[PDB]
């Protein structure tokens, strides 16, 4: 008891989604993923049809995201975004936005109106922290 | 102890005004032993303050008796080093050090405006280094500002001089207790930056200038007078409308002063914007406001 | 057969010829097929750079988006670095052209100031720089003089 | 997740031995800190000694132990567990000397202790003995050597290390110093260690407040430092 | 409800704890093993949490015997335990038969000892996985073993974190035939595929298994290979 | 229809102040920097 309520909810959702000819092209978008718990019932043609992947921003994409985010910025004109674009390590878009935000905060902290390159370097180092604890085992 | 320190100082002042080089390393040991004690803390603080007063005597003898400001650096190093042993959690003896620094600055102003540029430069540098960790209590870094004002006066505000003054007083961040005089010295910062002949870095500083608020209407009008200065500091950087804004601001003073000319000059400033002020709704409203002033029409130029 | 490398190469040649003859959609489809086949198997760096260059060229030609074309050009250039100077110089030229037509002339300077470009600095760089400047001041004549001075600059693309 | 896999040493989804993880928090539970550094021809250990009640023989309270004539150790964490581990280490050193005929190299001893800890964590019916250990010694043709263990059975050699509650800040400061280029002479090493500890704790300790133990190539014997000498070093560090 | 004790069976499938140990293995340092035409190559990422750690202190590829290397993924202490055990077994075999242990026998003995800890009781199973080189009888060998006690025999593989990408790249690149040097180039390439941060002569460990005995590569050689592109 | 009631507040009168009031006064500074204030 009290554990099958969620299954009742999912079944109601499946019935509503497929249900009857009440179509009115009411489109649906699901952004919760890592689809292993997803019921095959709510995974099939006629069901949610288009499965579209959102991989980690890769090289040639980190540059696009950097340019787009930094469009409106003071842009000291000495920091070369190419260094970070071609640099290794995996970083997601939220992380890149956070890096830019923190570089800006570091610049403003020292009453520096235009963000300078060392500020960007400091922000990049700060945001990259991986596990940050580990335990020296688990390798 | 209190009696011991008092008798030591009051008796050995005469004994040490004769010796110059070997004199210092006779109070150095007693200073050390006194500092190592912590029985009273507050009273031992007074004893250490008296010892540092004797050190200041050693220093003014050094400036006078022997080569000017040639051993003062050694005194500062000694009273920065021997301090370490009893600055538990960076307390107590630092308070005594700054209590002595009060007299140090009281005599360093005399050094600066009395002695030539070299010894005073060295002394100011040393005391500043001593007070790098020292927070802005009432004058701690204000001493640096005064020294750099001296320098910029001497070499007449070199670009590096303007940079030095602006950075030194920008280090005066929100850590100075005296807000009023802090305003009075950010005033000098604004003056120097405006003197930088940029109007751009002038705008940058104008940022922190606008951060200041209520510079006017302050009790006793002194800040109001300071207000004048900052209102006066506003210039071409202020557009042809803003100039009328700050001129109207200053116009309060001359009516109080009932000046024959400079009050007439203030009225002329607040009326002449119109030619510089392009037409618009608000400009019309404000010209209507200023219009009709009896004191204004006293000038034929108003009629013109 | 399974010689997927040659398959990718021929797919890219087909795309290039289709674009030359101006059948854009067919060139796009052939390019996508080449990309899939390349992703399927191993690819040396020159092949990948050439494929990316072709992709950027097609993306620019369709004109629908430019940032993507710019990025593709940049990747093709970086890859062609140290291996294909003849291709790298052209890639830099396309970099400048796309940036200029992005109505952002100013940053062109930074691009020619980039360390990698300096080694490749040459006539074409200054030609594009002056063209960008002419566009910057918004004088039809400035443009015309630049075009007249550098015929070779105008020869490559319409 | 946590809730069922938190009582015995058995795996959890996303394999995670939670017990060994808790052992490290236990180590921090002591409320102390220690720092070790390795110089050109010396190794130094420093710890803070806290006698809370005057009615206590300060001599009897100590955290630096002599594992062997040349190998010194500093323990951190639960006191009793540290003492037990120290005794085991002494036993192992003696056994090595007896069986093979030469003093045990520091690395091998550290390895033995790590192995014992590992076997404890694998099989149940024995607490993981939450105390961390640091060893210093001199190895012929290898110079000074510093090694560290942990309850989980992992060990490693270091150029400079910390343990205890302020581990992370101390290690960050040490890394900042080490990336800088220094010769690290004996006096330099001791000054570095004491400065690191003071700055991390911001205490400017008196000479009875901390213990120091150094091993030098000239005299490989592990010698515990005395109050007068440590005071002299401290004043010299103050300059 | 189950998946706590290594004794009881699931009400359908198989023991779970062993699967969880496998999961622990997955989240470990990347490792790569390539069986060349005339040798074997093992590579692993070795990154310390900071510069303080000494990189010459503890190694991750160790010689079990004159001609049997070994690399691991997962927990470390267990790696030490079973490397010691494997050395013991090889020596016992040599004593009994006066001949170097053929690699397959060593692999199966190690698998037996490893599965020994999966029997009932509180004794948790090993949380590591092993790759073994070997060049007995005239042909290179590469075996994999895991806590389950099963032992495979790869031509070329990659385990640990991001092993899927390594496997994809491997099947893309390695065909069937390479020499030791080209195998090394492929292996370092594979590590770079998932390796984070710039690789140096000290970030990664590399070992080879030829017809001269297994041998770990010194920092100079690995630096040289790291150079020259690749 | 007390500035400092906890004795030593240097920690309080410092980062907290510099992150509480600084974004409360001059939005122009940050918007010109292009960063949304904390």
Is there a contact between E162 and E30 (Cβ–Cβ < 8 Å)?
yes
Rounded Cα distance, B113 and E70, in Å: 79
Using CA atoms, how far residue D123 sits from D201, E146, E148, in Å, is 39, 19, 18
Give the SS3 label for residue D45.
strand
Using CA atoms, how far residue A41 sits from A26, A29, D185, in Å, is 19, 16, 72
> Which residues in chain D are closer than 8 Å to B84, comparing Cβ atoms?
204, 238
Mark whether A and E touch (3+ CB pairs within 8 Å): yes
- Picking from D63, D86, D78, the residue whose alpha carbon sits closest to that of residue D130 is D78
Six-digit token string for B114: 């009395």
Q: Give how many domains chain D has, as a whole number.
A: 1
In order of their start, the domains of chain E are 1-229 (3.60.20.10)
Is there a contact between D196 and D177 (Cβ–Cβ < 8 Å)?
yes
Rounded Cα distance, B59 and B65, in Å: 9
Method: cryo-EM
Rounded Cα distance, B230 and B211, in Å: 13
Best F4, F12, F26 member to test B by mutation, with max B CBs in 10 Å, is F26
Would the CB atoms of D125 and E17 count as touching at under 8 Å? no
Tally DSSP H helices, then E strands, for chain C: 10, 0
Element (H, E) at E208: strand E204-209
Rounded Cα distance, D194 and D48, in Å: 10
> Which residues in chain B are closer than 8 Å to A111, comparing Cβ atoms?
170, 173, 208
Measure CA of the first residue to CA of the last residue in chain E; give whole Å.
50
Rounded Cα distance, C123 and C84, in Å: 18
Would the CB atoms of D175 and E58 count as touching at under 8 Å? no
Element (H, E) at D90: helix D79-100
Rounded Cα distance, D67 and D92, in Å: 10
Name the pairing type of β-strands E71-74 and D210-216: unpaired
Is there a contact between D130 and D27 (Cβ–Cβ < 8 Å)?
yes
Best D15, D154, D161 member to test A by mutation, with max A CBs in 10 Å, is D154
Rounded Cα distance, B72 and B24, in Å: 11
Overall resolution, Å:
3.3
Element (H, E) at E42: strand E39-45
Element (H, E) at D95: helix D79-100
Six-digit token string for D135: 């060893």
Q: What are phi and psi of D72, to 5 degrees?
A: -115, 155
- Picking from D67, D78, D81, the residue whose alpha carbon sits closest to that of residue D110 is D67
DSSP chain B: -HHHHHHHHHHHHHHHTT-SSTTHHHHHHHHHHHHH--SSSHHHHHHHHHHHHHHHHHHHHHHHHSSTTSSHHHHHHHHHHGGGGG-TTS-THHHHHHHHHHHHHHHHHHHHHHS-HHHHHHHHHHHHHHTSSS--SSSTTHHHHHHHHHHHHHHT--HHHHHHHHHHHHS--TT-S-HHHHHHHHHHHHHHHHHTS-SSHHHHHHHHHHHS---SS-TTSHHHHHHHHHHHH--TTS-HHHHHHHHHHHTHHHHHHT-SSHHHHHHHHHHHHHHHS---HHHHHHHHHHTT-HHHHTSHHHH-
In this structure, what CATH number is given to the domain that contains residue D87? 3.60.20.10
- Picking from C100, C97, C53, the residue whose alpha carbon sits closest to that of residue C74 is C53
Identify the closest residue of chain A to B204 by CA–CA distance. A113
Give helix B142-155 / helix B117-130 axis angle, nearest 10°: 150
Rounded Cα distance, F30 and A104, in Å: 9
Structural domain that includes position D45: 1-239
Is there a contact between B162 and B192 (Cβ–Cβ < 8 Å)?
yes
Mark whether F and D touch (3+ CB pairs within 8 Å): no
Six-digit token string for C38: 């390349």
Mark whether D and C touch (3+ CB pairs within 8 Å): no
Under DSSP, the state recorded for D123 is S
Rounded Cα distance, E101 and E90, in Å: 6
Distance of CA D118 to the CA centre of its chain: 19
| Lookup result for tokens 């009881």 | E8
B74 CB neighbour count, 10 Å cutoff:
14
Rounded Cα distance, C9 and C18, in Å: 14
**CB within 8 A of A30, min separation 6: which ones?**
A48
Would the CB atoms of A135 and D21 count as touching at under 8 Å? yes
Under DSSP, the state recorded for A45 is B
**CB within 8 A of E111, min separation 6: which ones?**
E145, E149, E150, E151
Rounded Cα distance, B173 and B164, in Å: 15
Give the SS3 label for residue D39.
coil
- Picking from B175, B177, A109, A123, the residue whose alpha carbon sits closest to that of residue F22 is A109
Six-digit token string for D224: 């515990």
Rounded Cα distance, D114 and B228, in Å: 76
Give the SS3 label for residue A103.
helix
C50 CB neighbour count, 10 Å cutoff:
22
Six-digit token string for E206: 């590399």
Q: What are phi and psi of B96, to 5 degrees?
A: -65, -40
Tally DSSP H helices, then E strands, for chain F: 3, 0
Rounded Cα distance, C98 and C117, in Å: 16
For D:149-188, CB contacts with E below 8 A are 152-161, 171, 174-175, 178-179
> Which residues in chain A are closer than 8 Å to C65, comparing Cβ atoms?
none
Six-digit token string for B105: 């600055």
Is there a contact between E147 and E13 (Cβ–Cβ < 8 Å)?
no
Q: What are phi and psi of B58, to 5 degrees?
A: -55, -40
F37 CB neighbour count, 10 Å cutoff:
17
Would the CB atoms of B207 and F26 count as touching at under 8 Å? yes
Using CA atoms, how far residue E224 sits from C17, D75, E217, in Å, is 44, 42, 11
- The strand order across the sheet containing E128-132 reads E71-74, E128-132, E143-145
- Picking from D153, D235, D149, D191, the residue whose alpha carbon sits closest to that of residue D39 is D191
B84-118 core/surface letters (b: 16 or more CB in 10 A; e: else): bbbbeeeebbeebbbbbbebbbeebeebbeebeee
E157, β-bridge pairs: E33
**CB within 8 A of C119, min separation 6: which ones?**
none
Rounded Cα distance, E109 and E115, in Å: 10
Q: In chain F, after which residues is the C-to-N distance over 2.5 Å, breaking the chain?
A: 1
D156, β-bridge pairs: D148
Six-digit token string for B19: 């010796």
Give the SS3 label for residue D133.
strand
The beta-strand segments (E) located in chain D are: 33-38, 42-48, 64-66, 72-77, 131-139, 143-148, 156-158, 160-164, 210-216, 223-224
Is there a contact between B145 and B136 (Cβ–Cβ < 8 Å)?
no
Using CA atoms, how far residue B4 sits from B43, B57, B172, in Å, is 12, 19, 41
- Picking from C26, C79, C72, C30, the residue whose alpha carbon sits closest to that of residue C53 is C72
Is there a contact between C105 and C135 (Cβ–Cβ < 8 Å)?
yes
**CB within 8 A of D15, min separation 6: which ones?**
A138, E20, E21, E23, E24, E25, E27, E127
- Picking from D175, D141, D170, D165, the residue whose alpha carbon sits closest to that of residue D45 is D170
Q: What's the longest Cα–Cα distance across chain B?
A: 83
Is there a contact between A69 and A34 (Cβ–Cβ < 8 Å)?
no
Using CA atoms, how far residue E128 sits from B228, D152, E114, in Å, is 78, 15, 10
Q: What are phi and psi of B270, to 5 degrees?
A: -75, -15
Would the CB atoms of B90 and D238 count as touching at under 8 Å? no
**CB within 8 A of B293, min separation 6: which ones?**
B267
Six-digit token string for A104: 């800006």
Under DSSP, the state recorded for D66 is E
Six-digit token string for D22: 């808790």
Q: Which of B85, B89, B90 faces D238 most closely, judged by CB atoms?
A: B85
Is there a contact between D39 and D185 (Cβ–Cβ < 8 Å)?
yes
Element (H, E) at D190: helix D186-201
B303 CB neighbour count, 10 Å cutoff:
7
- Three-state secondary structure along E89-145? HHHHHHHHHCCCCCHHHHHHHHHHHHHHCCCCCCCCCCCEEEEECCCCCCCCCCEEE
Is there a contact between F34 and A104 (Cβ–Cβ < 8 Å)?
yes
Identify the closest residue of chain A to C66 by CA–CA distance. A64
- The total number of residues shown for chain E amounts to 230
Is there a contact between E170 and E157 (Cβ–Cβ < 8 Å)?
yes
Under DSSP, the state recorded for A122 is H
Element (H, E) at E41: strand E39-45
Q: Which of E25, E50, E77 faces D154 most closely, judged by CB atoms?
A: E77
Sign of torsion over alpha carbons C67, C72, C78, C84: negative
For C:95-134, CB contacts with A below 8 A are 110, 114
**CB within 8 A of E76, min separation 6: which ones?**
A137, A139, D153, D154, E58, E128
Distance of CA D153 to the CA centre of its chain: 15
Sign of torsion over alpha carbons C80, C86, C89, C94: negative
B212 CB neighbour count, 10 Å cutoff:
17
| Lookup result for tokens 């076997």 | D119
- Picking from E218, E25, E47, E216, the residue whose alpha carbon sits closest to that of residue E133 is E216
Name the pairing type of β-strands D143-148 and D223-224: unpaired
Q: What angle do CA D42, D75, D148 make, to 5 degrees?
A: 60
- Picking from D31, D61, D56, D34, the residue whose alpha carbon sits closest to that of residue D46 is D34
Element (H, E) at C80: helix C67-80
- Picking from D237, D135, D131, D119, the residue whose alpha carbon sits closest to that of residue D186 is D237
Q: Contact partners of D by the rule of 3+ C-beta pairs under 8 A?
A: A, B, E
From the CA atom positions of chain C, what is the Rg in Å?
A: 17
């Amino acid at each position: 008891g009290a554990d099958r309520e969620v299954q009742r909810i999912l079944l109601e959702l499946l019935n509503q989604m497929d249900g009857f000819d009440q179509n009115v092209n009411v489109k649906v978008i699901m952004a919760t993923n890592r689809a292993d718990t997803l019921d095959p019932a709510l995974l099939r043609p006629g069901r949610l049809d288009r499965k579209i992947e959102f991989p980690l921003p890769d090289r040639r994409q980190k540059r696009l995201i950097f340019s787009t985010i930094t469009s409106k910025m003071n842009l000291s004109e000495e920091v070369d975004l190419e260094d970070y674009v071609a640099r290794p390590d995996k970083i997601s878009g939220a992380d890149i936005n956070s890096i830019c935000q923190e570089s800006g905060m570091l610049a403003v902290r020292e009453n520096r109106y235009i963000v300078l390159a060392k500020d960007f370097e400091k922000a990049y180092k700060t945001v990259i922290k991986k596990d940050e604890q580990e335990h020296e085992f688990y390798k | 102890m209190a009696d011991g320190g008092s008798e030591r100082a009051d008796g050995r002042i005469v004994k040490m005004e004769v010796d110059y080089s070997a004199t210092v390393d006779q109070r150095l040991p007693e200073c050390a032993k006194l500092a190592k004690e912590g029985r009273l803390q507050e009273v031992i603080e007074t004893l250490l303050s008296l010892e540092k007063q004797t050190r200041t005597a050693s220093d003014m003898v050094s400036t006078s008796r022997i080569l000017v400001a040639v051993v003062k650096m050694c005194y500062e190093a000694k009273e920065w080093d021997l301090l370490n042993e009893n600055i538990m959690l960076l307390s107590k003896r630092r308070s005594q050090l700054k209590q002595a620094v009060a007299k140090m600055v009281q005599q360093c102003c005399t050094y600066v405006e009395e002695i030539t540029d070299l010894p005073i430069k060295l002394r100011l540098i040393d005391t500043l280094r001593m007070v790098t960790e020292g927070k802005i209590y009432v004058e701690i870094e204000r001493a640096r500002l005064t020294k750099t004002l001296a320098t910029i006066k001497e070499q007449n505000g070199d670009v590096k001089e303007a940079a030095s003054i602006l950075q030194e007083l920008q280090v005066e961040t929100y850590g100075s207790m005296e807000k009023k005089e802090r305003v009075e010295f950010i005033l000098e910062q604004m003056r120097l930056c405006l003197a930088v002949k940029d109007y751009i870095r002038t705008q940058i500083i104008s940022k922190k200038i606008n951060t200041k608020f209520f510079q006017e209407e302050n009790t006793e009008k002194l800040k109001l007078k300071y207000y004048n200065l900052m209102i006066q500091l506003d210039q071409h950087e202020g557009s042809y409308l803003s100039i009328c804004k700050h001129y109207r601001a200053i116009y309060d003073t001359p009516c109080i002063q009932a000046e024959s000319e400079k009050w007439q000059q203030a009225l002329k400033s607040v009326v002449l914007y119109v030619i510089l002020a392009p037409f618009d709704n608000e400009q019309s409203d404000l010209v209507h406001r200023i219009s009709g002033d009896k004191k204004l029409e006293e000038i034929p130029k108003y009629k013109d | 057969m399974d010689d997927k490398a040659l398959l990718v190469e021929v797919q890219l040649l087909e795309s290039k010829t289709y674009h030359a003859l101006s059948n854009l959609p067919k060139a796009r489809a052939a390019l996508t097929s080449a990309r899939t086949t390349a992703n399927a198997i191993y690819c040396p760096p020159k092949l990948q750079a050439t494929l990316d260059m072709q992709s950027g060229i097609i993306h620019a030609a369709e004109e629908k988006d430019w940032k993507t074309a710019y990025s593709y050009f940049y990747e093709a250039f970086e890859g062609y670095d140290s291996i294909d100077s003849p291709k790298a110089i052209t890639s830099l030229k396309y970099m400048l052209l796309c940036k200029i037509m992005l109505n952002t002339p100013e940053d062109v300077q930074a691009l020619v100031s980039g360390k990698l470009a300096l080694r490749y600095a040459g006539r074409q760089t200054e030609a594009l720089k002056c063209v960008a400047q002419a566009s910057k001041n918004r004088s039809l004549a400035d443009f015309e003089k630049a075009l007249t001075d550098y015929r070779a600059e105008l020869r490559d693309d319409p | 997740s946590a809730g069922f896999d938190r009582h015995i040493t058995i795996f959890s989804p996303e394999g995670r031995l939670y017990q060994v993880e808790y052992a490290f928090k236990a180590i921090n539970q002591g409320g102390l800190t220690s720092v070790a550094v390795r110089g050109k021809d010396c190794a130094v250990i420093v710890t803070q000694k806290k006698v809370p009640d005057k009615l206590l023989d300060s001599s009897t309270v100590t955290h630096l132990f002599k594992i062997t004539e040349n190998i010194g150790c500093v323990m951190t964490g639960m006191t009793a567990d540290s003492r037990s581990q120290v005794q085991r280490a002494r036993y192992e050193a003696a056994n090595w000397k007896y069986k093979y005929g030469y003093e045990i190299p520091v690395d091998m001893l550290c390895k033995r202790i790590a192995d014992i800890s590992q076997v404890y964590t694998q099989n149940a019916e024995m607490r993981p003995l939450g105390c961390c250990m640091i060893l210093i010694g001199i190895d012929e043709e290898q110079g000074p050597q510093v090694y560290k263990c942990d309850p989980a059975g992992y060990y490693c050699g270091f150029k400079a290390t910390a343990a205890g509650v302020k581990q992370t800040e101390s290690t960050s400061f040490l890394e900042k110093k080490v990336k800088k280029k220094f010769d690290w002479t004996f006096e330099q090493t001791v000054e570095t260690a004491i400065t690191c500890l003071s700055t991390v704790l911001s205490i400017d300790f008196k000479p009875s407040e901390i213990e120091v133990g150094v091993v030098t190539v000239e005299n490989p014997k592990f010698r515990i430092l005395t109050e007068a000498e440590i005071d002299a070093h401290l004043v010299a560090l103050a300059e | 409800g189950y998946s706590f004790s290594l004794t009881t069976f699931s009400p359908s499938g198989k023991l779970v704890q062993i699967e969880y140990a496998l999961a622990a293995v997955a989240g470990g340092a990347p490792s790569v093993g390539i069986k060349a035409a005339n040798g074997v190559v093992l590579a692993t990422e070795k990154k310390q949490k900071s510069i303080l750690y000494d990189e010459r202190s503890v190694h991750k590829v160790e010689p079990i015997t004159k001609h049997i290397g070994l690399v691991y993924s997962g927990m470390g202490p267990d790696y030490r335990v079973l490397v010691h055990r494997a050395r013991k077994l090889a020596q016992q075999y040599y004593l009994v038969y006066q001949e170097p242990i053929p690699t397959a026998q060593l692999v199966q003995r190690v698998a037996s000892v490893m599965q020994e800890y999966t029997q009932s009781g509180g004794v948790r199973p090993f949380g590591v996985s092993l790759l073994i080189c070997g060049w007995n009888e005239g042909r290179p060998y590469l075996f994999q073993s895991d806590p389950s006690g099963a032992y495979f025999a790869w031509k070329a593989t990659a385990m640990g974190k991001n092993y899927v990408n390594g496997k994809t790249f491997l099947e893309k690149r390695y065909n069937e035939d390479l020499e030791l040097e080209d195998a090394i180039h492929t292996a370092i390439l594979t590590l770079k595929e998932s390796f984070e941060g710039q690789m140096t002569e000290d970030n990664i460990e590399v070992g080879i298994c030829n017809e001269a005995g297994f041998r770990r590569l010194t920092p100079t050689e690995v630096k040289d290979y790291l150079a020259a592109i690749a | 229809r007390s500035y400092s009631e906890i004795g030593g507040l240097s920690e309080q009168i410092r980062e907290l102040r510099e992150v509480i009031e600084l974004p409360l006064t001059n939005p122009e500074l940050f918007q010109r920097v292009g960063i949304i204030p904390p």
